[PDB]
Amino acid sequence: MGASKLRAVLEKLKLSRDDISTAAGMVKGVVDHLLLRLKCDSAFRGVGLLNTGSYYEHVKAPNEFDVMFKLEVPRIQLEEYSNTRAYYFVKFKRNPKENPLSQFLEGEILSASKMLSKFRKIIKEEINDIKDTDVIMKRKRGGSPAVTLLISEKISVDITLALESKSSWPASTQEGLRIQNWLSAKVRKQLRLKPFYLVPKHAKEGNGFQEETWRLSFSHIEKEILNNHGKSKTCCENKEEKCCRKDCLKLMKYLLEQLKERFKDKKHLDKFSSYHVKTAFFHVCTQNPQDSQWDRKDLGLCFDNCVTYFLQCLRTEKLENYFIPEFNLFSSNLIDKRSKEFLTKQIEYERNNEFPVFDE
Ligand SMILES: Nc1nc2c(ncn2[C@@H]2O[C@@H]3COP(=O)(O)O[C@@H]4[C@H](O)[C@@H](COP(=O)(O)O[C@@H]2[C@@H]3O)O[C@H]4n2cnc3c(N)ncnc32)c(=O)[nH]1
Ligand SMILES: [Zn+2]
């Protein structure tokens, strides 16, 4: 693929500051309004907007946003559920002292369902026109911890609750984050000396669910390594060190989004998220630690590489969580072979025909 073609697509993706600010004002207003009322309850007293920039993950739909609320939970003990390596139960260490979240305690185990119930409840109470904006709450999609709300029948904002743990990272993440040769073991060291988050998501057990398990979240680390991607510290700070990592990620994400949009009727792509793309991209970054391997004039090649790798995952049904190596994202239990074969077919067609889906 021509670097000028792909860079033409990326040039098109770049939107004006007005379209990204006009909405961000109202969204920021609603969020800042909710944050105040969240502190009225003793449970959500230690809550706070996790500084991620208050931006979205989509590229072109920018009408949607994504915010994440962190909540510090001191002295927590995780319990690995059914050896899923990624889902845990929350058991507080010392309970003779009064605990704010005791109302959600299902014994020794913290109930995620009641937590999200109270959270979504308070939010649903504040959404009853208290502001000057017209905001309505969307239905629960099922299993989804996010609480989406709609402003002016145009802007969608998903609110997610997290559990901040300043303790040491779980043992499942021991062999994770293989950035030693890429961003140095020093950066890995200092990064692993950061808190890890927890999101209320139930894992699959077959003909049922738990609704009381929590998944490991490392979105902040992803943002960090994303905004600081080069092996060189001055990467993308001068004309001689401009790379194309971010460009590749944007291209992959946009490809997946366009394919998911084109086949919205069918359900073959509904089990694929941009996170699989991001993960695959991180794996490629590990496989290509040198900035020279990411020259901006090689955008075509680099991108192709990513595509190839992604395809390989789909072809092998293997996509390890970048932080939890044993946790496979493309396992047969999660996503079926049919969907992955479909996506391989579509993507392969796109690559073989100069990506006509970009011009849609
Ligand atoms: N707005 C919003 N929606 C989410 C989020 N995480 C999941 N969802 C959606 O809620 C359902 C939960 O599905 P699973 O978590 O069990 O696995 C989902 C699902 O298989 C796919 C996401 O598909 P989506 O269309 O975006 O909808 C999901 C899904 O309907 O990737 C998985 N996934 C998404 N984010 C991650 C992630 N960060 N780590 C591991 N797996 C992830 C989220 O963080 N924000
Ligand atoms: Zn760079």
Q: 146 CB less than 6 Å from ligand 1?
A: yes
Is residue 48 a contact partner of residue 1, using CB atoms and an 8 Å limit? no
Q: 141 CB less than 6 Å from ligand 1?
A: yes
Is residue 27 a contact partner of residue 154, using CB atoms and an 8 Å limit? no
Q: Which residues contact residue 284 at a Cβ distance below 8 angstroms, ignoring those fewer than 6 apart?
A: 248, 305, 306, 309
**Where do the CATH 3.30.460.90 domains begin and end in the chain?**
16-168+196-217
This PDB structure is determined at a resolution in Å of 3.2
Return phi, psi of residue 77, to 5°.
-125, 120
Show the tokens assigned to 125: 């109470």
Q: 201 CB less than 6 Å from ligand 1?
A: yes
Centroid of ligand 2 to alpha carbon of 58 (angstroms): 21
Reduced to 3 states, what is the DSSP secondary structure of residue 135?
Answer: strand
**Rounded CA Rg of the chain:** 21
* CA separation for the pair 347, 303 (Å, rounded): 13
Q: 331 CB less than 6 Å from ligand 1?
A: no
Reduced to 3 states, what is the DSSP secondary structure of residue 2?
Answer: coil
- Architecture of the structural domain at 16-168+196-217: 2-Layer Sandwich (3.30)
Give the number of other CB atoms < 10 A from CB of residue 22. 12
Show the tokens assigned to 340: 């992955």
Atom of ligand 1 lying closest to residue 217 CA? 38
Centroid of ligand 1 to alpha carbon of 260 (angstroms): 14
Helix axes 337-352, 299-316, angle to 10 degrees: 160
Is domain 1-15+169-195+218-360 annotated with CATH 3.40.50.10140? no
Show the tokens assigned to 3: 């670097």
Give the end-to-end CA distance of the chain in Å, rounded to a whole number.
17
Helices (H), 39-173: 112-126
**Where do the CATH 1.10.1410.40 domains begin and end in the chain?**
1-15+169-195+218-360
* CA separation for the pair 92, 133 (Å, rounded): 40
